[PDB]
Design a binder for this molecule. Structure first.
Ligand SMILES: Nc1ncnc2c1ncn2[C@@H]1O[C@H](COP(=O)(O)O)[C@@H](O)[C@H]1O
Ligand SMILES: Nc1ncnc2c1ncn2[C@@H]1O[C@H](COP(=O)(O)O)[C@@H](O)[C@H]1O
Ligand SMILES: *Cc1c(COP(=O)(O)O)cnc(C)c1O
Ligand SMILES: *Cc1c(COP(=O)(O)O)cnc(C)c1O
Lengths: 823, 823
């Protein structure tokens, strides 16, 4: 028995061992051999060959958390936007090299295989991206931490651009299984929907419900060089399958066909409005997760360690339920439903626990974006919970009635229950009422939250409101995507920087050393060189690897202002055509984003960007002086590829519309300079960086408010400007169209008569900034020197700093960068 | 590339190696731990340690058939009653002792873990047990065979007996993985349905058909120590998953959530009338299968041996198919559609090949049970197919007419299209005409085919109608299930019997060697000994070890007659009660077997048996001289516990009905005397063992036709036999059913007024032959010498004999017990 130990298995740094476990995983686990296998089959085997290493260091850590019994923090998020795992595993796990030499000998190319990897289809935006990065940092600073979410089968669709139009294709990423996850049939949980809340004896009983089964999958995540691997548990919706006879709800009518499919699509569809699925999915992930939670709360030393009930007096001291945005919000009614109805707790205690255990992270600047369910849905499908939500509502509103007595409107502004035609429940007021720390994501964001959107909650509980500025992981977005530069940082300042990023500041004595300058400018040269090459291998274009590489790789939306940059590209077009022998710093401007399904504008904007495209990129006079590419199907894969090759970073959002943003930061670590509004996280970059090193343009938020106040009148701009007057008549007549002229109608008219985002306001200064930017591009040694002053300054934007803060200020655990022993 | 070999990855009969493997798979395959593993878990550590070896030699054998390119055989059966893999594989690869030791040195006991495997529920009775044997014999004869069926997800039902009534629960044996199988997503195939045949220029095209996907799962099958490992490849149906927006059929209406579940439940369950799903299940298993069959004819080297058309002339030399019962008949016009329509042969060069490929095993005698689909039903979902059956039909009837000219009435009887209200297609007659061999599975059976059922097919095609008597593997059904009797037969003659069964006549010497005779009787004392105990441990009763273990395990169906056996037990019950102090040999009667839902008679016989049980097992006057036990959820792993323990095998059907009967045999080899009628495979056992070593009774087929001739009139037997009359009046008054007197009204009435099978008629003769049975049990040295004579004679019943006869007189290949090389 104690001979059934971990001990025996791993020869680590040896190539001959790896060739052996690769050959084992090809032949034995895969049940394939070389006369029939494929790139994908040797791809699986290698990943399985990497995974051995990985689950050994996981057993030891999991084991360790049960021995040393610490605070476990549970990161709830419905999107986990990981994207490709292999190399990332190899770099934090140090096998990077040992595997390449073993694959070369076996006679496979690692890069041929690493690109077979589909991005993990659990994700969409800078919500789930953030989640995946945070998890890296949770491991690297050694927190006993679980991230939970749903396992979706179909991701967020794959983009096809057909004729300059976006087509939605599907991401059936798990088509061939997923070698990293481990399925748990043993751990299937029931989740309940529907019901009837019968009130009886000591409480009430949720009776007669439909059940669905959440089956967990375990995907491990490995800390940077520190021998901790933690977990990512995700849940699959499974039907009970009596469906044919038992219960004898069938025989007669098998319309339970539906029970089962409406079940099955809880886990199918990821979401890009009020659809009862979205609520079934949120709840699903929450209910299953809280049962695995309290399950370990009781199990770890505590099913033993009771004193009274295995009382949840120490549930705050041992569990942390992190609500990433209102999508997890039924975690506060479902912990009080579990603690008050199934355990036999009473309200005031059960609340002391919810609140002391729970924390909320908000990611939206404007009141409209926040979640609110219609109360009849909750009443039909989640009854028990709508009672609890209303008791919570009652009570929190007697706290504000205690505090600010006699006010009527505060009670009616802060209420969880919104009145109106279509009565609602405001999930952000649930989470604020039920969480012990609320927090933002950039300095300005957390302050408008404190000063406009939640200030009635702010002055009841100022103590609650925190800020915890977003960040990036130096693993994924430096060492990994851009080794060339990680390397010339290594020799100058050490290796400690990847586990400690504020050390980059040491680079700031080497500002002037011409040796480093050329190295830094060499790496970028190599990078654009490479991108120009993937861009013309996987797809094709007539790039200039030397040109100013301009990128805007944002979600395609109106407040993210792709049109502000298209007007500026048609401004340089119109100059290079009006004066063909004038020196214009050549640019190749690339814009990527997937639209958002049927957002009319956005789909029309991608078609505009491929219009400028077919026009200027094909004109003879334009030459190679200017070029426009729309980057197809932007994703983690792809940012790892283009973020390295960028010189200028297009963070141009209307002042006050981005709550933070994180590609912003990514671009700064990769040595690129930002042209952006004084908004989001651009504030703290510029503040760290020196505004002298940053390109801030555009109206500050003051200037916005005021123009709304006096009236934005688009037209007036149009008329005191000739290049703008011109470019809009161009679009209009059909300059960029001509097989249907009248096609850009709705953009020419939106911009011109009804732009909510003020494009024309910033147009005079945006090009008068873009010129400065092109002048210093055309100065080599200082371009590279603005850059280093940015790179050196990158520190505060490492997610490790964001998790140390959560750790000590919202959660209550120190971090630790001490490398576990083991395997 | 050559560097990626099967080679370095083993140690085989090596304790220390297997204990090392077990620890990897528990912690790296299972990502479990000793601190967390279940019993269920240590069998996936062990079953995975035993699978490495099982697949290394599969790697090798399959390469070995591509290079050797032998004619290949494919057993098409809709049911493979596999059932428990750990030990058959341990003992077919000879790692049982080495494993027992490893797991033993680790500190688990191997027997514990063996019983956690749930039987691989892909079968149901005779038909499907058989197929499973033929795979172990066909591997053992080093033949290049294949097993292709549907993977049923829910098998068929698990039997629960509640209130002495049969409850059918669901078998989701697939609950925590089946480690013996390998999912191959990547060989998924389109199986086509409904549609229309558009006849264009050079033929017809089958257009507009719904498609369902056929996913394969690979289970290696290890021959006995001859290093071959073949494949059973079962197919899992699956919905296309375009069902959401991709197709523009949905969006607006997902009522084809239905298509999706009607498609998945082709693989969902076994069956258990003209049902659209049975035909769907039949076509499905055939079609994905005939594309692997034709694929390997093209891809298995023969793509470079094309000579002409990659000729399908070399198809019956190098492929062979078996229709195991009419459940794959659509393989014949499915093949003619693939050759003529999809390839491009003319209809004779396509038929020559088809009739030279198909050979079809039969197992039915009664007309009423031959397969017959309605032609409208073939029109709707297989329109091309019923066009091709009609071609076959025209011509086959023109052959027939060339031959029996003038006879119209023969023409109207031999056709594949039956007429009445609802015209049907005689799937029996399709099978015969599209084949180069038809064969019953027992001599009395093959002849009744030629004589009465298939006769006009034998005057026309005499040569075609062969026979190949059923048989059983010796490895599962004597070595694996009887290590004790395996041991002492080894002592007196060594192994070649296990691989060569008529070698057991050598035992006829030892008939009077007192060592032998103490040892055969001792082994049985101990098999009964452990079974008395599970009959206490896993379910409950107080068994007397020292009783005549009288067993009857059949399909609970009227003609199989457990109501003849119920009447003899009520007759001992009565006897032992009228005279409590007469020495009557003590017996344990045990009946088990599934009803099959909705058959009311059967469901009432299962209750009858348990009613009688409750009465005699609680009657104090009785003591342990008599006990009636219903064994529940009879399946392959019970059959392997109950058969070692049986002393009397009751093979009692109505004379003429059983066509053969694979279990008849299992008992003989396991030393139990057979009581039974002269029919089926009793016929060639009472011939092999000599009649007087058999308890043959009752009416012969002769006198059953005779009884029908003067008309069987139940009441006259009622009016002479005075113990009968007594049990009928006991049944009716509710002696056995006190709370509902009238509960067996149906059974009584049945017997008495409309018993199709002549139970009363065989009642005097059966009670007297049993009197002679308890007499001979009352004398241990002679009952044991009978037993020695029945075991000495088992040889004619190996599946190695039957398969040989297949290979040589039908499939045309040669068996070989020669070792293939490997690991
Ligand atoms: N009682 C325990 N003692 C030690 N380690 C444990 C214990 N329970 C769970 N673990 C560890 O945690 C893993 C399971 O994680 P969980 O899903 O949290 O139960 C096990 O495989 C061990 O690595
Ligand atoms: N061309 C081939 N040469 C050697 N071995 C082969 C070849 N094709 C198939 N095999 C072997 O046969 C197994 C089954 O092949 P398949 O018929 O493709 O399922 C493969 O997994 C290999 O072990
Ligand atoms: C970093 C990243 C994002 C983040 O979007 P922002 O608007 O930059 O915060 C989105 N998608 C991908 C693929 C990313 O790599
Ligand atoms: C052999 C076997 C059968 C065969 O039934 P017969 O009555 O013998 O034809 C049925 N069930 C199991 C479990 C078997 O192994």
């Amino acid at each position: 028995r104690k001979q059934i130990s971990v001990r025996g298995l791993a020869g680590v740094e040896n190539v001959t061992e790896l060739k052996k476990n690769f050959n084992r995983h090809l032949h034995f686990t895969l049940v394939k051999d070389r006369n029939v296998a494929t790139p994908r089959d040797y791809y699986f085997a290698l990943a399985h060959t990497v995974r051995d290493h990985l689950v050994g260091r996981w057993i030891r850590t999991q084991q360790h958390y049960y021995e040393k019994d610490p605070k476990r923090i549970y990161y709830l998020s419905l999107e986990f936007y990981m994207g490709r795992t292999l190399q990332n595993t190899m770099v934090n796990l140090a096998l990077e090299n040992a595997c390449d030499e073993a694959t070369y000998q076996l006679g496979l190319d690692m890069e041929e295989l690493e690109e077979i990897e589909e991005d993990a289809g659990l994700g969409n935006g800078g919500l789930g991206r953030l989640a995946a990065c945070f998890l890296d940092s949770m491991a690297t600073l050694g927190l006993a931490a679980y991230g939970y979410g749903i396992r979706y089968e179909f991701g967020i669709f794959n983009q096809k651009i057909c004729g300059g139009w976006q087509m939605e294709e599907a991401d059936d990423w798990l088509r061939y299984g997923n070698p990293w996850e481990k399925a748990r049939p043993e751990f299937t949980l029931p989740v309940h929907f529907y019901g009837r809340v019968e009130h009886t004896s000591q409480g009430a009983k949720w009776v007669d419900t439909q059940v669905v089964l959440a089956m967990p999958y375990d995907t491990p995540v490995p800390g940077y060089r520190n021998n901790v691997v933690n977990t990512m548990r995700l849940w699959s919706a499974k039907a009970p399958n009596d469906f044919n006879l038992k219960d004898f709800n069938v025989g007669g009518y098998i319309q339970a066909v539906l029970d089962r499919n409406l079940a099955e699509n809880i886990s199918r569809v990821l979401y890009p409005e009020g659809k009862e699925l979205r609520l079934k999915q949120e709840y699903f992930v929450v209910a299953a997760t809280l049962q695995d939670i309290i399950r370990r709360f009781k199990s770890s030393k505590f099913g033993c360690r009771d004193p009274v009930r295995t009382n949840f007096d120490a549930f705050p001291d041992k569990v942390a339920i992190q609500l990433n945005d209102t999508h997890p919000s039924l975690a506060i009614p479902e912990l009080m439903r579990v603690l008050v109805d199934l355990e036999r707790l009473d309200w005031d205690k059960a609340w002391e626990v919810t609140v002391k255990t729970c924390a909320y992270t908000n990611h939206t600047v404007i009141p409209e974006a926040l979640e609110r369910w219609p109360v009849h849905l909750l009443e039909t499908l989640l009854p028990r919970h709508l009672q609890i939500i209303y008791e919570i509502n009652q009570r929190f509103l007697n706290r504000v009635a205690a505090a600010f007595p006699g006010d009527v409107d505060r009670l009616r502004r802060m209420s969880l229950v919104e009145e109106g035609a279509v009565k609602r429940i405001n999930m952000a007021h649930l989470c604020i009422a039920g969480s012990h720390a609320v927090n933002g994501v950039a300095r300005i964001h957390s302050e408008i939250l404190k000063k406009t959107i939640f200030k009635d909650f702010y002055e009841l509980e100022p103590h609650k409101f925190q800020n915890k500025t977003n960040g990036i992981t130096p693993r994924r977005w430096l060492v990994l995507c851009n080794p060339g530069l990680a390397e010339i940082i290594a020799e100058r300042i050490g290796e400690e920087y990847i586990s400690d990023l504020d050390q980059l500041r040491k680079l700031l004595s080497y500002v002037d050393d011409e040796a480093f300058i050329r190295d830094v400018a060499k790496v970028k040269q190599e990078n654009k060189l490479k991108f120009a090459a993937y861009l013309e291998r996987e797809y094709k274009v007539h790039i200039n690897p030397n040109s100013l590489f301009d990128v805007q790789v944002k979600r395609i939306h109106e407040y993210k202002r792709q049109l502000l940059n298209c007007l500026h590209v048609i401004t340089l077009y119109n100059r290079i055509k009006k004066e063909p022998n004038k020196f214009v710093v050549p640019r190749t401007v690339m814009i990527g984003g997937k639209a958002a399904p049927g957002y009319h504008m956005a789909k029309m904007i991608i078609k505009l960007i491929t219009a400028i495209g077919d026009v200027v990129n094909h004109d003879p006079v334009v030459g190679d002086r200017l070029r426009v590419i729309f980057l197809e199907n932007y994703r983690v894969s792809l940012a790892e590829k283009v973020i390295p090759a960028a010189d200028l970073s297009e963070q141009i959002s209307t002042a006050g519309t981005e709550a933070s943003g994180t590609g912003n930061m990514k671009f700064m670590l990769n040595g690129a300079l930002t042209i952006g509004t004084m908004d989001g996280a651009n504030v703290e970059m510029a503040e760290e960086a020196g505004e002298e090193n940053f390109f801030i343009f555009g109206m500050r938020v003051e200037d916005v408010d005021r123009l709304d106040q006096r009236g934005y009148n688009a037209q007036e701009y149009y008329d005191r400007i000739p290049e703008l007057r011109q470019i809009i008549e161009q679009l209009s007549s059909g300059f960029f169209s001509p097989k249907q002229p009248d096609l850009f109608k709705d953009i020419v008219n939106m911009l011109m008569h009804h732009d909510r985002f003020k494009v024309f306001a910033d147009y005079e200064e945006y090009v008068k900034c873009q010129e400065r930017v092109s002048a210093l591009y055309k100065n080599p040694r200082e371009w590279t020197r603005m850059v280093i002053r940015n790179i050196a300054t990158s520190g505060k934007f490492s997610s490790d700093r964001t998790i140390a803060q959560y750790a000590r200020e919202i959660w209550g655990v120190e971090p630790s960068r001490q490398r576990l022993p083991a395997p």
